[PDB]
Amino acid sequence: SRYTGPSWKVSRRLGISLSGTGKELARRPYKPGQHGPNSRGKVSEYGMQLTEKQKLRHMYGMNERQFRTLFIKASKIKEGKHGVNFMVLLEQRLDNVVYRLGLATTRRQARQLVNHGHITVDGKRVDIPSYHVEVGQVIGVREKSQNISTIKEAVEATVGRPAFVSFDTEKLEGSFTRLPERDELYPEIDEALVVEYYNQK
Amino acid sequence: LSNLIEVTAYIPGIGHNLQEHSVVLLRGGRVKDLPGVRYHIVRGALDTAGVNDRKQSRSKYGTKRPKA
Amino acid sequence: AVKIRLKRMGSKKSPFYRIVVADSRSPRDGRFIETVGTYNPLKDPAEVVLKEDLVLDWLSKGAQPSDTVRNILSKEGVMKKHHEAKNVK
Amino acid sequence: PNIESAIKRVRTSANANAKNSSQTNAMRTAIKKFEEAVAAGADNVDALYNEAVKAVDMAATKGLIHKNKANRDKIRLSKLAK
RNA sequence: UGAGAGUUUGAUCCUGGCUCAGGACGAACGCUGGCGGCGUGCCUAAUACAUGCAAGUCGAACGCUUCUUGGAAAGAGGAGUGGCGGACGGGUGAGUAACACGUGGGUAACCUACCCAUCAGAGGGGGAUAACACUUGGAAACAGGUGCUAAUACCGCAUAACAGUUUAUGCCGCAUGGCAUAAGAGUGAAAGGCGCUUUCGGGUGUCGCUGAUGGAUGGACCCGCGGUGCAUUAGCUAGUUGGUGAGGUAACGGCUCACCAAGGCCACGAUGCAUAGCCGACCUGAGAGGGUGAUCGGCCACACUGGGACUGAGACACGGCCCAGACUCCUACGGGAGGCAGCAGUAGGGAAUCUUCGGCAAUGGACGAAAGUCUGACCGAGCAACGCCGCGUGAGUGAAGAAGGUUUUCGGAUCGUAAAACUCUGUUGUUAGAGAAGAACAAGGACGUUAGUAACUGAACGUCCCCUGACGGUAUCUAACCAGAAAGCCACGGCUAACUACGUGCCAGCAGCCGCGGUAAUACGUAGGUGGCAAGCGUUGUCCGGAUUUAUUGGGCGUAAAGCGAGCGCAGGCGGUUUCUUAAGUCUGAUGUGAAAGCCCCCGGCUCAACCGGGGAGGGUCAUUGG
Structure with a gap:
């Protein structure tokens, strides 16, 4: 499974955008359902660690088994911390590479482009x-049939191209120069709440 | 029971169809109503039948999915 | 009846073989005496690795190859060396 | 029996048993015939010693006693007469 | 790499139990399900078994007989004598608390078919027998009698002692003794087949045959140390413990005999009773530990229940023989036949576990000179969300929030950019084309080299032609078409993330622990909404953690549970200061070994991952030798 739901309720529940700052939290920044505008009392320190984990899990649209195996794999490095290495391995997956490069607006579109067999390494x-x-x-972009409508238009409007991504807009080739850093990557959510969440799993 | 030792067992849900000499299936689980009962029968597994109103936790109580 | 034969080590339809010296009564994948090289039927010019200093020592003690082991031991020039050590002295 | 080759082994081994027992009894009586004449103190005492030795030796080439049994036997008899 | 929480009270601190939050599984069952890859699938009755298959092969060891092409040579069948194989491969865990297994050693007490090397032989005779032909008794299974015949079948005579044993000599070892050399006494074998040269040539290639010695491989025996409960199980032994001799075995030995003596084992747990195959490994834990011995590899034990031997290099024999026993079956009543814990399959037991499939193309095994014949080992296919991994059930833009549902203080709010609408996509689906690797070979032809030869045939490997796929038209790749066929289960009072309506009224019902339900129930039952996971989701059972709740790591005994009513003392545990010595504990170096596969580290291949391969580390309370 992946997910197909309204994708915007999801951001209103984490309190973070999740879609390139394009505003889902423009009107009604509160949660969904009846008891949305009428908030209630405090949230535990279990709710906080759960909410951070869900923020990270829904950022890149993956499932719980795979998330946990990636986390267990990042723990075998012992060169640096354990949340930084995690959020950096998370970035090196072919979906984020298509998102960052700029061949797709969303991450769902980038996922369908890499699933339907339109890209090549x-x-x-x-x-x-x-x-x-x-x-x-x-x-690359499958130099067989790179004349598609949406890829063309989403190469023009470059909302965000980073400081670790290289690219040329004629042959349509991109690559990572080197590994990113936390300052360059969402210094907003966390990597410590998420590490604590898996201590008692 | 098949091994020929006797026990009493609670039958849950709202409304059943169990009569003398009908064959049933037991699982663990102790009720806190009275002494001497340590088992549950499982609904919809042999001669016993699932309850016929449920809409919310039919995986217990052995109710099939209704088109309603 | 010491032998030099192949032993299957793949998964289901990608076989791999270890070249091994075993007593002939043993099961194909059971007990053996020692391992002597490797052989890969895929990999279009098939890959052979082998020590060839234990093959020449077992051969001179009466071990005997199977039919495929003899083919891949002559493609390596091990049977010629046996020839030049035994019937030449 | 069920298998055809198991039916032949039955008669083959029956025949082997017959002749094996015949020849073992031959050897045993040769030895005993020497012993009963050395226990009497009789003339014609080295010839039947020779014959008993030959009997044992021939039984060992017919696959009836192992080979160490034959060495043992010839030793025992040698210590009795010669 | 060591996280905690609820619950004794009107309130508290301490003690203390019970319960919960994490993992995993050969799992079962309830609701619900789209695919591929790799694995797994009678844990119970070692219960009883219809039907098919699971071990044969050799005409280049030997005589016969039937055909297809009266004397003809080949091809294809049939039984028989003889060799080798049937002790492997495959199944199961009932017995077993012991050298059964693990680890480390010993045998100067040992055996070994086929395979490799070395030395020496291979002479000359005899008497039979199955088959076949005729014949008797048989319900049958099957038994007898007469007559002829072959061999690499069988038996004696020769020749061979390098084998064993005794004597002298020399060297040596851990008692018994070991090696080498010389003699003396009695003795023991053997078989041909197919080719080449064939002047009688009498020579020779190859495969077999006999004796002796080595290697390799496989087995046998003895020893140190290690892994279970009960003392509401303290005495056990009479071939028992030792000696002398005799027999016996591959072999030492009370192994078995006759005689002589009175010994042996036990609180450092003998004996008995109960339970159990053992290990590499697997799950869990910060570790020390604790719990299991399913798939895969090693060792052991068994083969309807219980005794025995025979053949053989090897068996006291898994589809062998003989006897007894229970059970089943056929019979003319005199008698006969059988053993799925091999692969499928069936009835039965159970909560519960698969097809009466294809092929020897690949790897291994038996026989054969070879083509080959056999192989339910094995390689493939079928069934099942049983498990692990991977990818889907669309993507982008889209408002004052369309209709409907739920709620409302009747203004609105929420389901909700979610639908609609526009533009795209084809992983999957369908239809149509192309399409593999797994295969290396044996055999057969020509050609070369070397060692033997009087010489050639052949021997032993090199170079080249030629020859084979069950899976299967499978994986895979290309073209067109379509958002069309593909989302459910649990929870929402506190632990513990997620709340409002209506129905009912200590009823109907719920609960893991606190505890809910008697008119406005966020705890029961529905609807709307929300949370966790997702082709799965919950429930029961079993084990480790949390549990310092058996505490070595790591707790206690004034009043919470807990100092014997007090002394005297055998065995045991622990002991003042110091000089020299020893090296048992302790510390340390080097060498051997602790299989393979697993966990872990680096590297590499399947589009990724599960998975697969190469090189390493680790793991002993281990042995030997030196400080």
């Missing part, structure tokens, strides 16, 4: 979105 096609893109691998 090093020339060879790769079809599965949880792929692990390493540093220095020019991912």
